[PDB]
Amino acid sequence: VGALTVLFGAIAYGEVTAAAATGDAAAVQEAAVSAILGLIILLGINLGLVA
Amino acid sequence: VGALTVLFGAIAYGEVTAAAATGDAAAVQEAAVSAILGLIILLGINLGLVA
Amino acid sequence: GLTTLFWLGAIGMLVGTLAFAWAGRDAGSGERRYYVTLVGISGIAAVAYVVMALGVGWVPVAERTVFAPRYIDWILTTPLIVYFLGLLAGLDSREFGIVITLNTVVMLAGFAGAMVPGIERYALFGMGAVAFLGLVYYLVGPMTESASQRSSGIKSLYVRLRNLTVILWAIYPFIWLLGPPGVALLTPTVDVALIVYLDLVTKVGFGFIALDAAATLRAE
Amino acid sequence: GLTTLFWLGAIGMLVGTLAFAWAGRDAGSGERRYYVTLVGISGIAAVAYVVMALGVGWVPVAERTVFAPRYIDWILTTPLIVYFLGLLAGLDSREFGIVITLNTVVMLAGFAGAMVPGIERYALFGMGAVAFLGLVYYLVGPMTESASQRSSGIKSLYVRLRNLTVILWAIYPFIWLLGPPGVALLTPTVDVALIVYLDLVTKVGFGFIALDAAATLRAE
Ligand SMILES: *C/C=C(C)/C=C/C=C(C)/C=C/C1=C(C)CCCC1(C)C
Ligand SMILES: *C/C=C(C)/C=C/C=C(C)/C=C/C1=C(C)CCCC1(C)C
Ligand SMILES: CCCCCCCCO[C@@H]1O[C@H](CO)[C@@H](O)[C@H](O)[C@H]1O
Ligand SMILES: CCCCCCCCO[C@@H]1O[C@H](CO)[C@@H](O)[C@H](O)[C@H]1O
Known part of the structure; x- marks a missing residue:
């Protein structure tokens, strides 16, 4: 559960960053x-x- | 843990929304x-x- | 990207399919159907994910994006999961017909609603939501009663798989409501990521739990 | 707002303080110190939170915001938590001196580092981080060995409080690093919210766990 949460977080961060661009x-x-x-x-x- | 996570989420959402304004x-x-x-x-x- | 997530889903389902197929290579005449059913569940899901990974079945409509293969997959695989649960519980034809009917309404409703722009999609959701409560009732009630008439091992496995199913299936409607099909607060990427996780657990996770109990069931 | 969070922290600490004080009203001569120590731990934290809630001690510097009362609180209350753990473990003066020394370095380091602009703050963090590992070693090693010489109930309570402490205290340095004191990826609001939660658990949660074991300890 811990690793996945970080994985999900990275994916979510990726979207936020792309949107920011x-x-x-x-x-x-x-x-x-x-x-x-x-x-x-x-x-x-x-x-x-x-x- | 469940209720708190939603509480934390609401607080976080509050910041995102304020920033968006x-x-x-x-x-x-x-x-x-x-x-x-x-x-x-x-x-x-x-x-x-x-x- | 979405394609990467779809490929991961496809790979996960394929690994599960192969594991279940291999695990059942020497299955007895009474266990056979269980292994074959598991292969069908993850096998069909694998196809659906591959199709979506290839960019097929994407329905970007009414300013949202839904995936036809997702719902077609569900319509065909969830009844097999219910069939597996029904086999463990020892249901007769009539009882199977009832839960498969309820299950089908849930899935058809989510499919139709996801393809309908406008507030009418919430009525379709409602139909599916009510059918779902009826299905949960059967899984926790009549079917659990039926399972209690079988061996301790079967009852235990039934309960374990039943709980995983009821608890996690209950989450899908919230993702439908909050995701693209509904209010669209979840982006397609986040929506797909959560569903890949849920699908792998409800099909492959479900399967490994059954595989892990096989030896104990044979021994009793 | 930040003030609302600080008030919630203050209220939480006050409720804990009052509960511990009341719970120890009829404490025996051997339990007394434990209740009094708990009152001091949450009592001082309550003051710190009230001060911050009143907008005092806010240090908006080097484009970040840190809170002096937070670190002053820690410098004064964490050694009391270690003292409580030390009392349960049955440490002598020398052993107490060692863990209090290590604890103090950790807290002074976080305080100084939080008030230092520039990369030098990471050296201060490092000093605190190393001292912390030394403290954890003592809590899990020498102190656990010492606690094992006491009653089964005391050993059990020690272990329970030790685990809560080691696990949750280990989280503070990451919040320091990711929060305003460090790279500032966490906003002041999120930083304060997480610390209010951690502080209440490590002090009030810690206390209620002890209160919940009191009767059992008396009975043995
Ligand atoms: C293999 C994938 C699985 C186990 C999918 C399960 C999907 C559900 C339990 C979906 C349920 C829905 C409702 C209860 C209400 C209407 C919308 C749905 C289809 C999302
Ligand atoms: C009552 C509040 C408690 C229990 C606070 C505990 C704080 C810590 C364990 C802080 C540790 C730190 C480090 C290990 C490295 C340097 C920075 C600190 C002070 C955040
Ligand atoms: C892959 C997981 C396989 C689990 C095996 C479950 C076996 C349930 O048990 C089987 O049920 C059959 C009825 O359908 C009976 O005819 C069999 O005698 C009985 O052993
Ligand atoms: C609020 C929680 C109180 C927990 C009570 C723990 C009591 C530990 O036990 C006490 O330790 C003392 C040494 O410090 C001894 O002198 C006492 O005889 C002994 O009972």
Whole structure:
């Protein structure tokens, strides 16, 4: 679960950075909310698997 | 751990949204990377507590 | 990229398919169906992922991107997962028909809803959501009761696979709602990444858990 | 806001302080010191958080924001946590002196480094990091050996508190490095939020775990 979370984080970071390269604050915000919700969901998945 | 993660997420989202309100892509990126790393660290904390 | 994630999903499913096929090479007449079913579950998923990895079935519509192969995969593989669970529980034809029917409504609903622009897609989601609760009821109730009539090992395996299934399947509708099919808060990349993870666990993870119990079941 | 988080930290510490104080109202002559120590740990932290909540001690320098009360708190409370662990382990003066010395270097290093602009702050971090490894060695080695000479209940409580401490304390240096004191990838808000959580667990959580074992220790 630990390694995967970092992997997911890297992927999410990749999107945020790509969005930033455009200079559009809105695009970065979209990628960031997606990353945040995704990480939260990832916790739900990890927790369910363990249980 | 579940409720806290959502609480942390809301706080992180709050920063991303505030940053977006400025229109500066760089500011949003800063808030997003912070949110991502923070959530990853939050997992580390939660996991350590459980163990 | 999306293609890289799809390839990873395909590789994961292929590894699982090969493992299950090999593991069942010398399976007895009573275990046979279980191994074959597992091969079909991950095998079909492997095809779906390869198709998507090749950039086929991508439906960028209504300002969102959904993947037809994902839903077609689900429509065909989830009923096989339910069939596997049903075999362990010892269901008869009637009971199988009930859970397969419920399962099918869930999957068809998600497929149709994902392809429908506008608020009507939430009605389709609702139909699937209700059918899903009915399916969970059967898995935790009637089917668990039925499984309790079999060996301790079978009951244990059923319960283990049942829990993994109910808990993780329950997550898919939230990803559907928050992802491209719904409000689109999750980007296609994040959406696909979460589904690749869930799919591998619900199919390959599911399979290895069964493989890991095989020896114990034979011994009892 | 930062002030809201600081107030939450203050409230959490106050609740803990009051709980420990009350829980120790009728403590015996041999348990007394433990309750009093816990009160001091969360009590001092409560003051630090209130001070920061009032906007005092904020050090926005070198384009980053660090909080002096945070480090002053640590310098004064972590040695009390080590003292509590040392009491359970049954250390003598010499042994106490060793771990308190190591602990102090760690905290002074983090404080000095947080207040130093430029790469030199990483040398200070290094000094603290090395001292920390020495401290962990003592907690898991010599001190665990010493604790093993006491009752089963004390050994168990020591181990439980030791594990919580080693595992969670190990996280602080990463937050220091990734946060404002270091590369500043974490914003002040996220930095403070994580520390409030860690502080409450390492002090109040730590305390409730001890309180929860008190009755068992008396009974044995
Ligand atoms: C092999 C992949 C698996 C196990 C897929 C499972 C998918 C589900 C349990 C999907 C459920 C849905 C609902 C309950 C509501 C409507 C939308 C769906 C299809 C996402
Ligand atoms: C009550 C608060 C607690 C338990 C604080 C614990 C803080 C630490 C274990 C800090 C450790 C650090 C290092 C090991 C390296 C240098 C920087 C520090 C001070 C962040
Ligand atoms: C790959 C995982 C295989 C798990 C094997 C489960 C075997 C369940 O058990 C089998 O169920 C059959 C009914 O379908 C019976 O006819 C068999 O006698 C019985 O052993
Ligand atoms: C708030 C949590 C309190 C936990 C009580 C731990 C008590 C440890 O045990 C006590 O250690 C003393 C030495 O310091 C001895 O003198 C006492 O006889 C002994 O009971």
